[PDB]
Amino acid sequence: SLRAASASLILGNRVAERELEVAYSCDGVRAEVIPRMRRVDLYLKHDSQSYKLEVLFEDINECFGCHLDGTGAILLQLTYAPRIHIAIWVRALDFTPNSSFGECSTLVLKLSKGASVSYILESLPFSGELGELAIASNVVPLVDCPNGFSVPYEVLFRLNSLVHMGKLVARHVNADLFKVLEDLSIDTLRRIFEKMSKLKSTCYEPLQFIRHEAHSMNKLMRCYRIHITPSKIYCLGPEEEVSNYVVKYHSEYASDFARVTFVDEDWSKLSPNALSAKPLKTGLYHRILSILKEGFCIGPKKYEFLAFSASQLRGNSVWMFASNSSLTAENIRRWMGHFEDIRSVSKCAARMGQLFSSSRQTFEVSSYDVEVIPDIEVTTDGTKYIFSDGIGKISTRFARQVAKLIGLDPAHPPSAFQIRYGGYKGVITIDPTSFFNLSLRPSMKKFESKSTMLNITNWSKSQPCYVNREIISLLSTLGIKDEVFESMQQDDMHESDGMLTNKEAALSVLGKIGGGDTKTAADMLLQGYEPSSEPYLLMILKAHRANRLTDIRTRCKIHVQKGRVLIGCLDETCKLEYGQVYIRITKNHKEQKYSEQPFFCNDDGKTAVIVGKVAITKNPCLHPGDVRVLEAVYDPGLDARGLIDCVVFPQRGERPHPNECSGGDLDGDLFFITWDDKLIPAAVDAPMDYTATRPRIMDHAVTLEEIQKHFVSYMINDTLGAISTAHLIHADRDPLKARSPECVQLAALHSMAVDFAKTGAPAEMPLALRPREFPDFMERWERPMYVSNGVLGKLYRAALRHAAGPPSCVYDPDLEVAGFDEFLDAAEERYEAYAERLGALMTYYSAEREDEILTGNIRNKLVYLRRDNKRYFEMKDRIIAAVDALHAEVRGWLRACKEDDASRVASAWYHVTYHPDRRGEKRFWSFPWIICDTLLAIKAARRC
Q1: Which of 84, 102, 136 is the last residue of a domain?
Q2: List the disulfide bonds (predicted).
């Protein structure tokens, strides 16, 4: 099964299908193919040092058997560069003199003497045979425009991205190519590339292609993403994302902005092991740092480090700027505010990061309109707590205005907002009595800034309730019995299976999900459509039920009907004291129908108040008694003040309850609240004791250097994942569950680790506690396993067990407006439009089915997205957002039409996308239904 062979390694690039060009060669290469590990280990010696090379099957784009100068050889074309290790087996960067592992994609193994390639091939992914000969010749590989020509930056960037992806050879990218580009038109030019990108293999005749389909010449901001790989860089074609304040304000220099992320060869999150061994600094660590300090250069832009968001640090990403005469990075920093007078490098980086959070711009607010009010502290037993930590208030009027500006309902605005206003970060909650538009507090101010632009990062919405493994663990520790989680899950799965064979079920499950598709489909169902008869409906229902069940099995994301996930708002009135909270909520699909329930008291006829006991906690929670049980009460005042869809905490007491839950801060964090009798714990463990984490002070004002070193240090010393993993494991197996000292010990480290990003205090994981045996549920395939006795395992296996022509397209005549036929040719125009534009969005995000790009759930996850959940979810956010913008543009195309005129127009649309004869090979259902509002309406009008 395992295969071994001796060869000489050749490194280069195919120029035509069968001509290779060498940039490196080495002899004495020992080669191992290990099908079980799905990896190809190459053992090599170069100079006087011995190196190991790792190639994964997932890396290999194309495999070939070949004839090279009298012997048989194997050709690999590689999507991602091989990983490299040095013997001291420690990872290292390109070692070749000319950075050839960076420069070239294609790699050859030249076997010698009696080699049957086929013997080697046998245990490799599909192969093909071509037999033919070759010819010989900071951050790399890159291309540059020749001295003569001018092409807009986005073009050069795209060309690169294509070369990196392996689509286009570098050498072909010459003066011959560029003039075609220059006569070439930017909108089209990009359009050409997208179709160039969908190619299976490398294109060795670009000019022909480009000129061929050029002859057949048939909001959001572009963002320039960049991956610095150990041996490689990758340009990611400018993708339309939601912006943030800093980049949006400098719109004239938007092109000069770039997003750099430091990853491994297949864009995997860099294991801290790659940057340490008595730990020994590796070489990769020195590279990332070096890039931060020196910067790297593409085309006319030479980038310099600028800043990194709070979240970007966790994402190992960073904001970089291409300084010019008109504007330099530092100018942007000083423009942001005054960081001369903070003394901790860590929070330095953080406050430089604040303004970069993705947000929506609103109203510039004057100083006199802004009210600075005291903080509501308290001191208990030698420890001082802040109730008002991170939270302020906003006028009702101004709240309506802000709400309207960000596309929400002015009549009914969000009760709370999460904002960046100059140096203020945090939450402002509506105060009807408040005279001032804003009423900020010292808690929220982090630095002085000239900026008076109010930016909203988030707002209060009543998100449906879900548990997860962290919460479930603690609940079971606190006496909550396995059978209620089992029941909860069984209910959730059945409903989820439900969607396909029941209208009510479908409506409910779509109720617990927030997307354009959810309400589109809900509205469609409510008019009487069903999956069998209607393709789009079936599409969505299947997709969502699939992702839903996957969520249940993988993450233990199980629906809790009685409860919600809300944002914390403070009780300004102070008529509320410790041990109580006040919750008023917008009634969901089900509560509406059976509203007379014990937990609910006051009923507003469409909203109601919680009265029972409630259990509350915040993610992440590793300590028992991060779960707090409080009494929900009715206060007439707060009823009158109109606060809704948030949980209102006491202003009074020995300790503020947010602080009792994990971190306990009011800066836009979300609490899990349930009033399900079956989930509240009988008695609660004492809250965690206060942290004693001190940042300290230094003489120097903060260097850039320190900021960069802090960033990398975070790379090396992160342990949130490892601790969370090990803690969950121990909580599952050990008798004491979450209390077992191993779990207490571990949980203590977690606080230090979350504290780490901003205090610079490492959390150190004892080698002993790191586990070599992983549980059934965690699905760590590559490592040893144990069937688990705990409830996480019971749930896992229940879920796994649950997993154990009707489709049709019936054109609905009813959906036929009379004058239609008028615009079908026109429709064909813009359907087609929509159809390739989605198509682009599909290829970029490696979406392949309509489901994936409308839902945002990629069913086939690429290698780097699978275990790093956060960045995949960021990608889901960005996919959904981009698609939403597109749909806005399409609802758009309707807007144009004569108000009398349009309605007919859609019907045309519907028909062009649903008639058997007029749509022949079109592969999309999405399109007409962007206009369900217009269509469903017309339907209703006939149906009686």
Answers
A1: 136
A2: 569-646
What tokens does 891 get? 């609802």
Query: Within this chain, do residues 380 and 292 fall inside the same structural domain, yes or no?
Result: no
What's the longest Cα–Cα distance across the chain?
91
Angle at 281 between CA 279 and CA 282, to 5 degrees: 120
- For residues 101 and 22, state if they share a domain: yes
Residue 62 CA to residue 200 CA, distance in Å, equals: 9
| Rounded-to-integer distance, Cα 416 and Cα 439, Å | 13
Cβ neighbours of residue 175 closer than 8 Å, sequence gap 6 or more = 146, 148, 149
Q: Are 661 and 670 in contact (CB under 8 A)?
A: no
The C-alpha atoms of residue 210 and residue 415 are separated, in whole angstroms, by: 54
On whether both 41 and 64 belong to a single domain, the answer is: yes
DSSP string, 514-549: -SHHHHHHHHHHHTT--TTT-HHHHHHHHHHHHHHH
Q: What angle do CA 374, 376, 379 make, to 5 degrees?
A: 130
Say how many C-beta atoms besides its own lie within 10 A of residue 32's C-beta: 15
What region, left, alpha or beta, does residue 159 occupy, with left being phi > 0 and alpha being psi -120 to 50 degrees?
Answer: alpha
Q: How far is residue 546 CA from its own chain's centroid?
A: 19
| Bridge partner list, 394 | 430, 438
Q: What is the residue-wise DSSP string for 802-854?
A: HT---------GGG--TTTTSSHHHHHHHHHHHHHHHHHHHHHTT--SHHHHH
Q: Determine, yes or no, domain membership for 509.
A: no
- Look at strands 438-440 and 370-372 and give their pairing: parallel
Reported as half-sphere exposure (CB side, CA atoms, 13 A), residue 11 has a value of: 20
Q: Which residue type sits at 663?
A: G
Q: Calculate the CA dihedral of residues 41, 44, 50, 56 and round it to 10 degrees.
A: -20
Q: Which amino acid type is present at position 83?
A: R
* The one-letter amino acid at 737: K
For residue 355, the Cα-to-chain-centroid distance in whole angstroms is 19
451 with 336: CB under 8 angstroms? Answer: yes
Given its phi and psi angles, is residue 501 left (phi above 0), alpha (psi -120 to 50 degrees) or beta? alpha
Q: Which helix or strand (DSSP H or E) is residue 68 part of?
A: strand 60-68
Report the number of distinct structural domains present in the chain. 6
> Of 327, 344, 345, which is closest to residue 336 (Cα–Cα)?
327
- Amino acid (1-letter code) at residue 82: P
3-state secondary structure of 874: helix
Please answer whether residues 545 and 496 qualify as being in contact, where contact means their C-beta atoms are separated by less than 8 angstroms. yes
Tracing tokens 């489901």 back to the chain, one arrives at: 851
How far, in Å, CA of 750 to CA of 395, rounded? 38
Domain carrying residue 666: 462-480+561-689
Residue 682 lies in a domain: yes
Would you say residue 497 lies in a domain? no
Strand order in the sheet with 233-241: 233-241, 221-228, 257-262, 317-322, 301-307, 297-298
Strand pairing of 49-56 and 134-136?
Answer: unpaired
Residue 88 counted as domain residue: yes
CA distance linking residue 690 with residue 623, whole number of Å: 13
Which of 317, 341, 365 is the last residue in one of the domains? 341
Neighbours of 117 (CB within 10 A): 23
- Show the tokens assigned to 454: 């109010």
Whether 402 contacts 417, CB under 8 Å: yes
List 560's β-bridge partners, or say none: 465
Q: Which residues contact 708 (CB under 8 A, 6 or more apart)?
A: 289, 292, 293, 305
Which ranges constitute the DSSP H helices of 688-777?
Answer: 704-717, 720-733, 741-759
Across 185-277, the runs of DSSP E, i.e. the strands, are 221-228, 233-241, 257-262
Cβ contact 913:920 at 8 Å: no
Half-sphere exposure of 174 (CA within 13 A, CB side): 6
CA distances from 877 to 358, 514, 854, 870, 926 (A): 12, 11, 11, 10, 19
- Tokens encoding 840: 């682009």
**Helix (H/G/I), strand (E/B), else coil: 610:** strand
Structure tokens at 640: 């009158």
